Design a binder for this molecule. Structure first.
Ligand SMILES: O=C(O)CSc1cccnc1C(=O)O
Ligand SMILES: [Mn+2]
Ligand SMILES: [Mn+2]
Ligand code: NA
Length: 619
């Protein structure tokens, strides 16, 4: 109903039908069309025709370039103001701040950014009214997980960005089948605008619409809403990637008895024809995608990839921890990707791939720092800033956060159960960080409670202090930027799994690929040689007597690690445990958990801190 002609948006639909949508999906679409005032509404069907036509359209408006060296590959170069997730403009709205972050004892919370309902309503009203004027509102119906999966969740993303539509087609399962599957079911409401209504009030840079000053990425878990304004980039705009996958899903997980985690999932098969699935949580620049797609050096071993970023895991009636990758694609960091570091990624990204902020070769190929591949005499480079570039030039040819966005189905070692609706049974969970000193190559937690403590205690060398100097920062569970709710309550949720009847608790490990000697040289060759550490984990899960007790947990026995063909590895330095180092380490973990988790620190985590202190004290 209406007394005039401004509420019914049927006449503006250029694909699909408002009439055909489920009731609550129509209310979401039409209500936001009323608010945002798009010129057109395009209900996405997910078809190849739709996708090809949208790429060709972006190519027409100079938003993307075709990469002529490859099969159906594309390049977007952004406004340099819009190149990454912005944590300081990423917020969660709850009635009480304590539900979102623990109230710290002394300092500012680094475990999330709470925004009041009141501040959000004012921020929303200052951004969204009229924000899509002159633009198409695309309606993206998407599944996080295989369409039928009991572990899958559905979203609807409204966006004014064709780049988001194309990228969501790769990274999620989207289109008409999702609407038909959803019916009158619950879904996560995802609203996105680049925040540049036409006619443009400000200059358009590099054909990349964004509003850096008003950039705000908001999560309202109580309303099942994600509302993102002003960035067209990655984790700010692809609302499945982090906003749904980790922040909303971790809150749903808490409510519903499951886990939404920043973990790769891989399947590993040994020479005895036994296969196990492992999950691993690493912070930035620690090589998750490299591990998830490992080419093992050990003969008779096979690694296969289920996912490189997000794991949704739920203990089933039988007690198995069943995990799905809720994504449909890999959104990998391009720099440092080489035939040496990740040959399977190199194979994956040569067709049907969208690249963002990488360099382009004159023959229509891609380039970045660490590609570790020479160009034939004659081949020149255009930087990600669309300027001629030479290897001696002092700025990088690719943005350090530049990306490939590639279908998961194209990975030559994609696991045959990567889309199984039941998920895969997780037998080990691996935590890890970049630690140039003190921390052994691998250790195993003494118990589930010790393992949750090891997660909570994760630290990693930052890319910088942000002028020259290193910082060792805390990144518990690799979730510091991604917690959907109070981290103390998340620790309690993890600890509660031990009390779930029938639960088969996976073995917990911690790895450090990055330990250095006195001269700053890596003690471990890494890459495919990491298969030797996975072999040790595999045997430990089978109950092999291959461990020695230390104050930090179990490490490999003398002669337990397969070092056949590495020549002389310095195992003594690589597994060295210094009382002085670990006294300092437990003090930093104590100060951190006391301040940042404070009243919400579970008893069992404090007990694990006391126990580690006591074991170090007896060295
Ligand atoms: O900065 C961005 O928008 C992307 S951040 C990202 C992308 C893919 C997978 N993981 C991450 C992450 O920040 O952990
Ligand atoms: Mn046009
Ligand atoms: Mn990630
Ligand atoms: Na551009």
């Amino acid at each position: 109903p209406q007394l005039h002609n401004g509420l019914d948006f049927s006449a503006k639909v250029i694909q699909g039908s408002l009439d055909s949508l489920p009731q609550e999906v129509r209310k979401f679409v039409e209500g936001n069309a009323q608010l945002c005032q798009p010129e057109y509404i395009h209900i996405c069907d997910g078809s190849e025709e739709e996708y090809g036509r949208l790429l060709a359209h972006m190519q027409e408006e100079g938003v993307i370039r075709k990469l002529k060296k490859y099969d159906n590959c594309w390049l977007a170069l952004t406004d340099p103001r819009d190149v990454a997730r912005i944590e300081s403009k990423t917020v969660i709205i709850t009635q009480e701040q304590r539900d979102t972050v623990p109230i710290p004892k002394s300092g500012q919370s680094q475990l999330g950014r709470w925004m009041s309902e009141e501040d959000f309503e004012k921020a929303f009203n200052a951004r969204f009214p009229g924000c899509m004027k002159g633009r198409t509102m695309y309606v993206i119906p998407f599944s996080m997980g295989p369409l039928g999966s009991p572990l899958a969740k559905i979203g609807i993303e409204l966006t004014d960005s064709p780049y988001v539509v194309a990228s969501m087609r790769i990274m999620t399962r989207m289109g008409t089948s999702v609407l038909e599957a959803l019916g009158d079911g619950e879904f996560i409401k995802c609203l996105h605008s680049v925040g540049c209504p036409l006619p443009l009030k400000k200059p358009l840079v590099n054909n990349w619409a964004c509003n850096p000053e008003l950039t705000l990425i908001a999560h309202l878990p109580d309303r099942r809403e994600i509302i993102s304004f002003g960035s067209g980039y990655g984790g700010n705009s692809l609302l499945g990637k982090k906003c749904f996958a980790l922040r909303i899903a971790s809150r749903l997980a808490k409510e519903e008895g499951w886990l939404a985690e920043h973990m790769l999932i891989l399947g590993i098969t040994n020479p005895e024809g036994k296969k196990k699935y492992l999950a691993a949580a690493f912070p930035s620049a620690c090589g998750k995608t490299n591990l998830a797609m490992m080419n093992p050096t050990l003969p008779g071993w096979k690694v296969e990839c289920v996912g490189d970023d997000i794991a949704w895991m739920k203990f089933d009636a039988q007690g198995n921890l069943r995990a799905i990758n809720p994504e449909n694609g890999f959104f990998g960091v391009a720099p440092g990707t080489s035939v040496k570091t990740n040959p399977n990624a190199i194979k994956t990204i040569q067709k049907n791939t969208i690249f963002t902020n990488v360099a382009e070769t004159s023959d229509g190929g891609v380039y970045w720092e660490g590609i570790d591949e020479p160009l034939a005499p004659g081949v020149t480079i255009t930087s990600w800033k669309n300027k001629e570039w030479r290897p001696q030039d002092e700025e990088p040819c690719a943005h350090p956060n530049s990306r490939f966005c590639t279908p998961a189905s194209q990975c030559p070692i994609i696991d045959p159960a990567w889309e199984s609706p039941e998920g895969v049974p997780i037998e080990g969970i691996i935590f890890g960080g970049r630690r140039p000193a003190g921390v052994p190559l691998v250790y195993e937690a003494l118990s589930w409670q010790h393992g949750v403590f090891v997660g909570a205690a994760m630290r990693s060398e930052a890319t910088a202090a942000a002028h020259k100097g290193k910082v060792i920062m805390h990144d518990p569970f690799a979730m510091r930027p991604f917690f959907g709710y109070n981290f103390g309550k998340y620790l309690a949720h993890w600890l509660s799994m031990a009390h779930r009847p029938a639960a088969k608790l996976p073995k917990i490990f911690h790895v450090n690929w990055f330990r250095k000697d006195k001269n700053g040289k890596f003690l471990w060759p890494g890459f495919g040689e990491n298969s030797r550490v996975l072999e040790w984990m595999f045997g430990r899960i089978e109950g092999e007597d291959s461990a020695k007790l230390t104050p930090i947990g179990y490490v490999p026995k003398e002669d337990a690690l397969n070092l056949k063909g590495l020549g002389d590895v310095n195992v003594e330095e690589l597994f060295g445990i210094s009382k002085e180092f670990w006294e300092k380490e437990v003090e930093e973990i104590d100060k951190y958990l006391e301040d940042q988790v404070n009243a919400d620190l579970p008893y069992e985590i404090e007990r694990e801190l006391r126990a580690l202190k006591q074991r170090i004290s007896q060295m």
